[PDB]
Design an enzyme around this catalytic site. Structure first.
Site, mmCIF file in Angstrom:
data_model
loop_
_atom_site.group_PDB
_atom_site.id
_atom_site.type_symbol
_atom_site.label_atom_id
_atom_site.label_comp_id
_atom_site.label_asym_id
_atom_site.label_seq_id
_atom_site.Cartn_x
_atom_site.Cartn_y
_atom_site.Cartn_z
ATOM 1 N N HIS A 109 66.735 -13.260 19.799
ATOM 2 C CA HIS A 109 66.569 -12.845 18.415
ATOM 3 C C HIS A 109 66.399 -11.338 18.280
ATOM 4 C CE1 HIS A 109 62.012 -13.078 18.593
ATOM 5 N NE2 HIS A 109 62.146 -12.145 17.671
ATOM 6 N N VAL B 75 56.025 9.978 22.087
ATOM 7 C CA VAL B 75 55.814 11.243 22.783
ATOM 8 C C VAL B 75 56.489 11.160 24.143
ATOM 9 C CG1 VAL B 75 54.112 12.858 23.717
ATOM 10 C CG2 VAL B 75 53.622 11.587 21.596
ATOM 11 N N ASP C 185 65.807 -18.826 23.315
ATOM 12 C CA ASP C 185 65.632 -17.464 22.796
ATOM 13 C C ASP C 185 65.538 -16.481 23.966
ATOM 14 O OD1 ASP C 185 65.311 -15.323 21.147
ATOM 15 O OD2 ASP C 185 63.241 -15.811 20.521
ATOM 16 N N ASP D 180 46.684 -12.580 20.148
ATOM 17 C CA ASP D 180 48.042 -13.117 20.109
ATOM 18 C C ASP D 180 49.039 -11.973 20.223
ATOM 19 O OD1 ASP D 180 50.053 -15.101 19.742
ATOM 20 O OD2 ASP D 180 49.482 -15.491 17.643
ATOM 21 N N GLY E 204 57.094 -6.998 16.653
ATOM 22 C CA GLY E 204 57.372 -5.857 17.501
ATOM 23 C C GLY E 204 57.121 -6.102 18.972
ATOM 24 N N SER F 187 58.208 -9.011 20.292
ATOM 25 C CA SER F 187 59.246 -9.958 20.667
ATOM 26 C C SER F 187 60.132 -9.394 21.759
ATOM 27 C CB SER F 187 60.114 -10.309 19.465
ATOM 28 O OG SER F 187 59.394 -11.114 18.569
ATOM 29 N N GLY F 188 60.539 -10.280 22.664
ATOM 30 C CA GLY F 188 61.375 -9.909 23.782
ATOM 31 C C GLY F 188 60.620 -9.458 25.008
HETATM 32 C C1 479 Z 1 56.167 -13.821 13.582
HETATM 33 C C2 479 Z 1 56.658 -13.110 14.839
HETATM 34 N N1 479 Z 1 58.080 -13.404 15.045
HETATM 35 C C3 479 Z 1 58.596 -14.635 14.963
HETATM 36 O O1 479 Z 1 57.919 -15.622 14.675
HETATM 37 C C4 479 Z 1 60.076 -14.749 15.258
HETATM 38 C C5 479 Z 1 60.909 -13.755 14.456
HETATM 39 C C6 479 Z 1 62.381 -14.080 14.437
HETATM 40 O O2 479 Z 1 62.828 -15.124 14.890
HETATM 41 C C7 479 Z 1 63.274 -13.072 13.872
HETATM 42 C C8 479 Z 1 62.976 -11.811 13.381
HETATM 43 C C9 479 Z 1 64.153 -11.129 12.954
HETATM 44 C C10 479 Z 1 65.275 -11.863 13.120
HETATM 45 S S1 479 Z 1 64.962 -13.388 13.794
HETATM 46 C C11 479 Z 1 55.828 -13.454 16.061
HETATM 47 C C12 479 Z 1 56.158 -12.996 17.326
HETATM 48 C C13 479 Z 1 55.375 -13.334 18.412
HETATM 49 C C14 479 Z 1 54.269 -14.129 18.200
HETATM 50 N N2 479 Z 1 53.916 -14.585 16.994
HETATM 51 C C15 479 Z 1 54.693 -14.244 15.959
HETATM 52 CA CA CA Z 2 57.012 8.216 25.815
#
Ligand code: 479
Ligand code: CA
Ligand code: 479
Length: 223
Positions: A40, A57, A84, A171, A175, A177-178
């Site tokens: 994603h 920086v 994912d 948690d 930002g 993600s990945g």
């Molecule tokens: C709320 C946040 N992100 C998502 O739930 C997935 C977001 C998702 O699929 C997409 C975003 C843009 C295009 S597709 C999160 C991340 C980690 C832990 N808890 C919450």
């Molecule tokens: Ca840096």
């Protein structure tokens, strides 16, 4: 990361920032020329930023390397978030050192109860928004499949696991993600999704990397 701590500069040497003019996702360096991230997080025009602490920086240990190709898992479903995971190849190999280092893929799947390290540059607030400039860290256990499925009825596939705290407060978040979930020195998860961040009974959900080791190895071997 909500409820975490400042990792310290370059203490998570496999953590990368994906930048398209701005940080938008994390990733994990798995060899000198390949990064694992979430499907994603796919977009064109990715620059991989290695050796980062403060992402605003230039501190002296960074390597900035553009991606030559991205490969989203063939079975990724953006509605359900099943599978994912994506791979990103760097145009040139990173120079590996103590502060820029690959993370091993798992030999076995990690069990519920195992303690892991989750990291990223995502939002640090469960209500509202504050980004950090420096890398944040969270130690959290993998939760049982039964408690994950009870938290998210009808949503948890065999390619997902929950980690965190049912009481909330700690948690991953927007930002992050990945980015990595590392347990006993192996990459076991990818930050994938949740319902909000750090809410009670809504732990983070993570891509189950051990299910993808064959796909990762075979894809790297032919690309
Ligand atoms: C709320 C946040 N992100 C998502 O739930 C997935 C977001 C998702 O699929 C997409 C975003 C843009 C295009 S597709 C999160 C991340 C980690 C832990 N808890 C919450
Ligand atoms: Ca840096
Ligand atoms: C110095 C410390 N080392 C560990 O925590 C090793 C052990 C480890 O990963 C974990 C134990 C429990 C959950 S994860 C460190 C390094 C980098 C970032 N934060 C802390």
């Amino acid at each position: 990361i909500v409820g975490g701590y400042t990792c310290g500069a370059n203490t998570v040497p496999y953590q990368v920032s994906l930048n398209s003019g701005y940080h938008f996702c994390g990733g994990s360096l798995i060899n000198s020329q390949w990064v694992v991230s979430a499907a994603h997080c796919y977009k064109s025009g990715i620059q991989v930023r290695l050796g980062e602490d403060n992402i605003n920086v230039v501190e002296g240990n960074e390597q900035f390397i553009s991606a030559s190709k991205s490969i989203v898992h063939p079975s990724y479903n953006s509605n359900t978030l099943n599978n994912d995971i994506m791979l990103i190849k760097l145009k040139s190999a990173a120079s590996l050192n103590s502060r820029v280092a690959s993370i091993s893929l798992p030999t076995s799947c990690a069990s519920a109860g195992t303690q892991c390290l989750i990291s990223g540059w995502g939002n640090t607030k469960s209500s509202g928004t504050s980004y950090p400039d420096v890398l944040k860290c969270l130690k959290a256990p993998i939760l049982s499949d039964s408690s994950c499925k009870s938290a998210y009825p009808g949503q948890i596939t065999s390619n997902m696991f929950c980690a965190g705290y049912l009481e909330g407060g700690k948690d991953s978040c927007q930002g992050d993600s990945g980015g990595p979930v590392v347990c006993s020195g192996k990459l076991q998860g990818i930050v994938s999704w949740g319902s909000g961040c750090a809410q009670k009974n809504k732990p983070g959900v993570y891509t189950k990397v051990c299910n993808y080791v064959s796909w990762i190895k075979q894809t790297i071997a032919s690309n």
